Ligand binder design. Structure first.
Ligand SMILES: NC(=O)c1ccc[n+]([C@@H]2O[C@H](COP(=O)([O-])OP(=O)(O)OC[C@H]3O[C@@H](n4cnc5c(N)ncnc54)[C@H](O)[C@@H]3O)[C@@H](O)[C@H]2O)c1
Ligand SMILES: NC(=O)c1ccc[n+]([C@@H]2O[C@H](COP(=O)([O-])OP(=O)(O)OC[C@H]3O[C@@H](n4cnc5c(N)ncnc54)[C@H](O)[C@@H]3O)[C@@H](O)[C@H]2O)c1
Ligand SMILES: [Br-]
Ligand SMILES: [Br-]
Ligand SMILES: [Br-]
Ligand SMILES: [Br-]
Ligand SMILES: [Br-]
Ligand SMILES: [Br-]
Ligand SMILES: [Br-]
Ligand SMILES: [Br-]
Ligand SMILES: [Br-]
Ligand SMILES: [Br-]
Ligand SMILES: [Br-]
Ligand SMILES: [Br-]
Ligand SMILES: [Br-]
Ligand SMILES: [Br-]
Ligand SMILES: [Br-]
Ligand SMILES: [Br-]
Ligand SMILES: [Br-]
Ligand SMILES: [Br-]
Ligand SMILES: [Br-]
Ligand SMILES: [Br-]
Ligand SMILES: [Br-]
Lengths: 127, 127
């Protein structure tokens, strides 16, 4: 049994973010640049959503508008499931599997301090 | 250690496919309807590619054409890692982690008989 604190230590404390009013083009370019599949959507230090590859895959082409003309807020997930430092690997795997989400932001006392994904949990398990 | 055959028994042998000449619009509608993130791209028995949410997210908007004018073959992954009934859950995962692919078609004697994803492996791990 491993804590989220320790899972984050293994993985790193990078938080890659974007603003809700930025373009989906810029968002998808940023995911490509970092080879990631999610962005924390931050406004005035508030986590207002998460933008994922699934959000893009499901929503973007259904808008009668190009990606440069769509804002992140239009397609982001607004209800964000997250974990805290005292949650465990068991908790993460259950949330990922049963909620069917690939990313779990990590929140500490009001601050987004990291992100864990399904790939992190797989990597930790096989290491 | 578990066999791929065992894993596929748990998962079931459903294969959701699309043809290479079909439109990306139709492909993404099909992923949405089935709540999946990949389609196997077949020409008769031949696995010619896999179209994934990541293909869509990385490639689609960069093309010099709209999605309804784009064919699956234009953005699908042609180089498709796969497992067979000689493989194990360990092989799966290692390959998922090392190659950064979330889906593995399962073949037996040269025929696509199913698909295993990162979510299937994680679900098996917490079973
Ligand atoms: N070889 C490795 O070290 C390793 C690590 C992670 C994932 N993977 C593989 O890559 C593929 C995709 O991974 P995934 O489904 O986990 O999703 P993903 O592509 O979003 O995750 C990749 C990595 O980026 C991190 N990440 C994603 N969004 C982030 C954000 N906004 N801020 C900070 N970090 C962020 C994750 O924590 C993970 O470490 C899978 O096939 C997986 O198995 C491999
Ligand atoms: N609770 C569950 O039974 C369960 C099972 C699998 C995945 N998940 C979760 O759902 C989310 C998405 O899953 P994922 O990242 O593994 O990718 P995914 O959405 O593509 O996979 C979802 C399911 O569909 C199947 N699938 C995908 N493409 C298929 C195809 N073309 N033909 C036949 N079957 C296909 C997979 O094998 C998997 O069982 C993740 O959060 C994951 O942890 C939950
Ligand atoms: Br770090
Ligand atoms: Br950032
Ligand atoms: Br903004
Ligand atoms: Br907002
Ligand atoms: Br996603
Ligand atoms: Br832009
Ligand atoms: Br939402
Ligand atoms: Br997701
Ligand atoms: Br077995
Ligand atoms: Br089908
Ligand atoms: Br076709
Ligand atoms: Br082809
Ligand atoms: Br056949
Ligand atoms: Br063949
Ligand atoms: Br994918
Ligand atoms: Br991919
Ligand atoms: Br053309
Ligand atoms: Br391309
Ligand atoms: Br390719
Ligand atoms: Br690795
Ligand atoms: Br075989």
């Amino acid at each position: 049994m491993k804590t989220v604190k320790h899972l984050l230590q293994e993985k790193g404390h990078t938080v890659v973010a974007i603003g809700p009013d930025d373009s989906v083009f810029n968002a998808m370019q940023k995911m490509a640049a970092d080879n990631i599949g999610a962005l924390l959507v931050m406004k005035d230090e508030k986590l207002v959503g998460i933008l994922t590859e699934r959000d893009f895959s499901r929503k973007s082409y259904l808008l009668d508008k190009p990606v440069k003309d769509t804002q992140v807020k239009e397609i982001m997930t607004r209800q964000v499931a997250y974990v805290d430092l005292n949650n465990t690997n068991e908790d993460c795997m259950a949330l990922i599997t049963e909620m069917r989400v690939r990313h779990l932001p990590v929140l500490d006392d009001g601050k987004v301090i990291g992100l864990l994904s399904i790939g992190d949990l797989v990597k930790d398990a096989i290491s």
